Every structure is written in C-alpha cells, then in structure tokens.
Design a protein around this ligand. Structure first.
Ligand SMILES: CC(C)C[C@@H]1CN(S(=O)(=O)c2cc3cc(Cl)ccc3[nH]2)CCN1C(=O)c1ncc(-c2ccncc2)cn1
Ligand SMILES: [Ca+2]
Ligand SMILES: [Ca+2]
Lengths: 233, 54
C-alpha cells in the first residue's frame, strides 16, 4: 500500500499473507473460512512452494497470535492467463483450520446481485496489505489499509493501456498518491455495509503504483461467487 | 421511484431481495435472521465481516 493508514488492532482480521521459503511475504490473501483462503492466480507463480500466515500485523516482531498454515490444495481458476491477467483468482485449502481470534477472522461472501446492486455502488472499499510503500520502495513491515473509491467502468477502460475484462474492476485515485502496489496482490478488497465487511475484489494489477491517471485493477469477485462456492465444495 | 430493496436496502441488515413485490431479507453464512426478519444475528463468535475489537 502507498499512502493509507496502519491497520490498528483488530481492524483487518481477514488478511492472510503468503510467505515464501525464506519466510518473506510475497502476496496477500483473504480468509474465507477456517479452511480456505482467496488469492490471485498470478500469486502462485511468485514462489515454488509457500505457506499462509494469518494474524500478523508487524512482520518484524512476533506479537503472538500469528500462525503459519500449510496449503493442502491449490485451486487455480482453469482460465487464468498470465498474459491478460484475466480470471486472476485462486482458492487455497489449508491442511489445518484457522483458529479465529483477535486479528484473525473471515470476511463475508456476498450474494451476486445484491453485491453488484448495493456493494459495488457504495463509494469506496478498503484494500489492505504488506506490499510496497511506493513504486520503487520496499515492502511494508506494518500491515496497511487504504480506502479506494470505486471507479466508473468507462473512465477506467479509458485510462488503461491494457484490456479491462468483465472479470476486473477499477478502484483508486486518478491523481492522489494512494494505491495498492507490488506485494499487495491477491490481498483483500472489501466493502463495508452497515457494520459488516464483504469481500468484493482481489488486488490483481495496476500500471505502476499510484501513477497519475491510472487506477488499481481488482478481480471482480461477484463474477466468481458460484465458482468460489464449488471450489469450497 | 425507489422501492423495496432500492429504498435503504429494504430495512435489511444484509442481503435484500424483492420477491413478488415485497422485500425478503437474508444474511451471510454464520448469521441468522432475527424474529423481525430484517436483522442478522451472529450464531458464534468470529462471525464473518466483523473487526475483532468490539
Ligand atoms: C508493474 C506494476 N505491478 S505491481 O507493482 O505488482 C502492482 C500490483 C497492483 C495492484 C493494484 Cl490493485 C494497484 C497497483 C498495482 N501495482 C504489476 C506488474 N506491473 C505492470 O505495470 C503491469 N501489470 C499488468 C499488466 C497486464 C495487464 C493486463 N493484461 C496484460 C498485462 C502489464 N503491466
Ligand atoms: Ca508479527
Ligand atoms: Ca492513480
């Protein structure tokens, strides 16, 4: 995240972090239930083998409350394409269930029509992550959140050098220096409604980080609700 | 002319549906619809979608 604020105690509990062999964060994820983490398919090429960390806020210390889990099953969408970034979504089944507690808890899955009619029409959602703090910078050691306005579909195709498919949606700022960034990928985009947070997107890609006239591109979770369901059995 | 689910989510805490010409509210997994049929009550702790803090 570029800009944004720290997630304070208890505020981003659905955040998972995928960590490589060196125990270094390379991608994010969203806890869906005690067994299943949602992430981007493009994240599964960023390391040969990986584990899932949850309940971490500050990767430099060990608060206590953090747990590594090993992945039992990776379900990558059958259509994912490295080259278009289309269908950028995967589900991981954990070998052992997540123990919910402070800083560790699931985000809700919405229903499709309701999500698209009500959630995606709110003004903003919240994306969060351990990713880089500027385009050219280092990954964050604190977990960060950022409020990002939904972007009109058209504007955002207009802004984009690459195709925006119906599986993607744009969020962020035209000029303000706030955006997700490398490392935040696969992480949560959630939209608050009354006092409940629903998953709405997966940090997928952007042209740089926080460039003027460019937005963040998210996988449209509502397009894959049935598929996520199947995957979870 | 904003009606049913289009008027303030039809009073629903979470999912609203216009079924016939009336609002039917419902709730994510791990909640139950209250007696009033609009509010969503968590059945356990660590319900989805809540910050672990209140
Ligand atoms: C650079 C920026 N990154 S990043 O810094 O990892 C990044 C991820 C991300 C997510 C969000 Cl929501 C905001 C910012 C952001 N920055 C991805 C590769 N890059 C590219 O610039 C790039 N990405 C994708 C494609 C692409 C897209 C669609 N189809 C084909 C190629 C081309 N270049
Ligand atoms: Ca820690
Ligand atoms: Ca921008």
């Amino acid at each position: 995240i570029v800009g944004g604020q720290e997630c304070k105690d208890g505020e981003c509990p659905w955040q998972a972090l995928l960590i490589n062999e060196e125990n270094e964060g390379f991608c994010g994820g969203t806890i869906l239930s005690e067994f299943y983490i949602l992430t981007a398919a493009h994240c599964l090429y960023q390391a040969k083998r990986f584990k899932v960390r949850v309940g971490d806020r500050n990767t430099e210390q060990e608060e206590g409350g953090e747990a590594v889990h090993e992945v039992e099953v990776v379900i990558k969408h059958n259509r994912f394409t490295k080259e278009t970034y289309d269908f950028d979504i995967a589900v991981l089944r954990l070998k052992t269930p997540i123990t919910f507690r402070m800083n560790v808890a699931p985000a809700c899955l919405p229903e499709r029509d309701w999500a698209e009619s009500t959630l995606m029409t709110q003004k903003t959602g919240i994306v969060s992550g351990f990713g880089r703090t500027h385009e050219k910078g280092r990954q964050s050691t604190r977990l960060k959140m950022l409020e990002v306005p939904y972007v009109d579909r058209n504007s955002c195709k207009l802004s984009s050098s690459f195709i925006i498919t119906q599986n993607m949606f744009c969020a962020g700022y035209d000029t303000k220096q706030e955006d997700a960034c490398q490392g935040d990928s696969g992480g949560p985009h959630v939209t608050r409604f009354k006092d409940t947070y629903f998953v709405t997107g997966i940090v997928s890609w952007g042209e740089g980080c926080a460039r003027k006239g460019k937005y963040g591109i998210y996988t449209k979770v509502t397009a894959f609700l049935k598929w996520i369901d199947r995957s979870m059995k | 002319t904003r009606k049913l689910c289009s008027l303030d989510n039809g009073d629903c805490d979470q999912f609203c549906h216009e079924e016939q010409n009336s609002v039917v509210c419902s709730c994510a997994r791990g909640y139950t619809l209250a007696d009033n049929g609009k509010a969503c009550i968590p059945t356990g702790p660590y319900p989805c979608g809540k910050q672990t803090l209140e």
